Design an enzyme around this catalytic site. Structure first.
Site, PDB file in Angstrom:
ATOM      1  N   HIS A  40      -3.649   1.833 -25.532  1.00 61.96           N
ATOM      2  CA  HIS A  40      -2.743   2.562 -24.619  1.00 61.96           C
ATOM      3  C   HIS A  40      -2.301   1.686 -23.439  1.00 61.96           C
ATOM      4  O   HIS A  40      -1.576   2.164 -22.634  1.00 61.96           O
ATOM      5  CB  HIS A  40      -3.263   3.958 -24.259  1.00 61.96           C
ATOM      6  CG  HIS A  40      -4.497   4.022 -23.420  1.00 61.96           C
ATOM      7  ND1 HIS A  40      -4.569   3.507 -22.166  1.00 61.96           N
ATOM      8  CD2 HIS A  40      -5.702   4.582 -23.642  1.00 61.96           C
ATOM      9  CE1 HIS A  40      -5.764   3.725 -21.667  1.00 61.96           C
ATOM     10  NE2 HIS A  40      -6.459   4.376 -22.538  1.00 61.96           N
ATOM     11  N   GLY A 142      -8.934   3.425 -13.690  1.00 65.82           N
ATOM     12  CA  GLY A 142      -9.137   2.002 -13.863  1.00 65.82           C
ATOM     13  C   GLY A 142     -10.341   1.631 -14.700  1.00 65.82           C
ATOM     14  O   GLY A 142     -10.611   0.435 -14.868  1.00 65.82           O
ATOM     15  N   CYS A 144     -10.857   2.507 -17.972  1.00 66.69           N
ATOM     16  CA  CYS A 144     -10.591   2.385 -19.400  1.00 66.69           C
ATOM     17  C   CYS A 144     -10.829   0.953 -19.857  1.00 66.69           C
ATOM     18  O   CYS A 144     -10.471  -0.006 -19.168  1.00 66.69           O
ATOM     19  CB  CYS A 144      -9.158   2.813 -19.714  1.00 66.69           C
ATOM     20  SG  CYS A 144      -8.754   4.486 -19.162  1.00 66.69           S
TER      21      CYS A 144
END
Ligand SMILES: *c1c([C@@H]2Oc3cc(OC)cc(O)c3C(=O)[C@H]2O)cc(O)c(O)c1O
Ligand SMILES: *c1c([C@@H]2Oc3cc(OC)cc(O)c3C(=O)[C@H]2O)cc(O)c(O)c1O
EC number: 3.4.19.12
Lengths: 299, 282
Positions: A40, A142, A144
């Site tokens: 993503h 932040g 991920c």
């Protein structure tokens, strides 16, 4: 004493990098000459709901991906996609690459999460894969790309990569193959975790750990059949106890001389009476985030 | 979202852990620069646990009586001395993995991370707090003497604790890195017990603020709260200033909780400092 312990994160700290594509920045896992991160990262603000990742990736070049290991910028020489994880090939192998392997864990199994932000590790904690395939973790924006792992014999088994937070506050992610745990998808469309349950085999292991450390007040003179225990425990929203679970509790039963179904009778009474003001291993609740392997390892 | 007992990343401390052997005793040592630090009880024998004379026991040992193992390499000891309850072994090689560090001494109610090691090999890491009774409710399953506690500010590791022993009540006692004990304890196998422990009230209030951030607001005068809470530690002006919903409104919530779950806990957790809440929730 008994502590919820996480594995030493040092071998993983040396693998966390910072991956930027466009204005999106998250964490990556640098192993050999490959960087792993959630796919993503290639999404823009208009690609959050229904992204076609094959179409988005084919529009990218190697220079569209900015990989940063500390202050050193890594040159991307290749990019590909496997399920929901993006693989960024770099021209430099990570010299801090430990012995590692990719595994997929079952519900109820535990692992340690290294929370990272901008490729910088900020904290480590221990958690378990819930029966509903969610993680009751601690993540901010932040995070991920943070990974979950176990260490077995100086080899790091990577089992989790964080992808998103669900509206209930829990977290969902994939294995290092890019396959999500549970029915979730990397899309910002409203998703909801299924009904969670208590990991029964973990509570029994935690009770065995209490006896090992010297607490016996919760035991009783009763026993139970496996089916009668499941009939009662499931009324408290406990996961069913299988024969494989009973076999797994074998070593702890032999070490304590307490039959598994005898400990099941104890748990059935604990659920019935509560704690009555007392504690077990410093907790007033029935802890279910210790596996039978975690009990043996710490004891 | 979420709230966990988070420990600092232990990588900077793992590179310092070594194994120290003296006689029949093997425990953990902290290798910083060209000096290894470990509990001075490593020089005791089986028959010298009740009333050891550490000054006499150290004078009779030479450098080669200390065996320091750093991975697959044996470090050569060239000097040995004592600072309070910590033994300092001078080795001929500075530790190349030495981080930016400093020795600090913490106060009761402050938290830190422990890298529990087994004979020099790190095995686990956890977060805990210095109880008001100067004890640590940790997990030390033997071979963990010499394990250290620390915090990390910027890239600087603040070593604050070294584990020495477990008390009969299951809790543990140790020193700072200068060998000064936390609490009224001595390093001998004698009759000693931890004092009546009290709850860190300022950490409970901070933990309630973390619950309001996480979606728990169902339960949302200073002297009046203290008198009821003291029936727990007392709250100071600095406590309310450090916790800067007004604080007094949260005290009324805590007062209505002591008489007559939160973040998945049936107990009022008191091992999260006000800064720990800010560090994790931001
Ligand atoms: C975004 C995220 C996560 O991105 C994200 C993408 C997505 O589909 C494309 C669905 C959902 O649900 C999410 C999330 O929940 C976001 O948390 C994570 C991080 O760390 C950053 O930096 C980011 O930009
Ligand atoms: C011993 C210990 C600890 O040694 C120890 C020494 C002592 O006085 C000299 C008092 C007490 O109480 C203790 C302990 O409780 C012991 O845990 C620790 C470790 O790791 C080893 O290996 C050892 O031999």
């Amino acid at each position: 004493g008994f502590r919820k312990m996480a594995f030493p994160s040092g071998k993983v700290e040396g693998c966390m990098v910072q991956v930027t594509c466009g204005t999106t920045t998250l964490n990556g896992l640098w192993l050999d000459d490959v960087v792993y991160c959630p796919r993503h990262v290639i999404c823009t603000s208009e690609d959050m709901l229904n992204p076609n990742y094959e179409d988005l990736l084919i529009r990218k070049s190697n220079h569209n991906f900015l990989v940063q290991a500390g202050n050193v910028q890594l040159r991307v020489i290749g990019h590909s996609m496997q399920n929901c994880v993006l693989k960024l090939k770099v021209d430099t192998a990570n010299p801090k690459t430990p012995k590692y392997k990719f595994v997929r864990i079952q519900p109820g199994q535990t692992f340690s999460v290294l929370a990272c932000y901008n490729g910088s590790p900020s904290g480590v904690y221990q958690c378990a894969m819930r029966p509903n395939f969610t993680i009751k973790g601690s993540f901010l924006n932040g995070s991920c790309g943070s990974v979950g792992f176990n260490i077995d014999y100086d080899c790091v088994s990577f089992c989790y990569m964080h992808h998103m937070e669900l509206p209930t506050g829990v977290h969902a992610g994939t294995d290092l193959e890019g396959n999500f745990y549970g029915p979730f998808v990397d899309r910002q469309t409203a998703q909801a975790a299924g009904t969670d349950t208590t990991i029964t085999v973990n509570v029994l292991a935690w009770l065995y750990a209490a006896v090992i450390n010297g607490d016996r007040w919760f035991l009783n003179r009763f026993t139970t059949t496996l089916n009668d225990f499941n009939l009662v425990a499931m009324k408290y929203n406990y996961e069913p106890l299988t024969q494989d679970h009973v076999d797994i509790l074998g070593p702890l039963s032999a070490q304590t001389g307490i039959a598994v179904l005898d400990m099941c009778a104890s748990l059935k009474e604990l659920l019935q009476n509560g704690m009555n003001g007392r504690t077990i291993l410093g907790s007033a609740l029935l802890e279910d985030e210790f596996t039978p392997f975690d009990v043996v390892r710490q004891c």
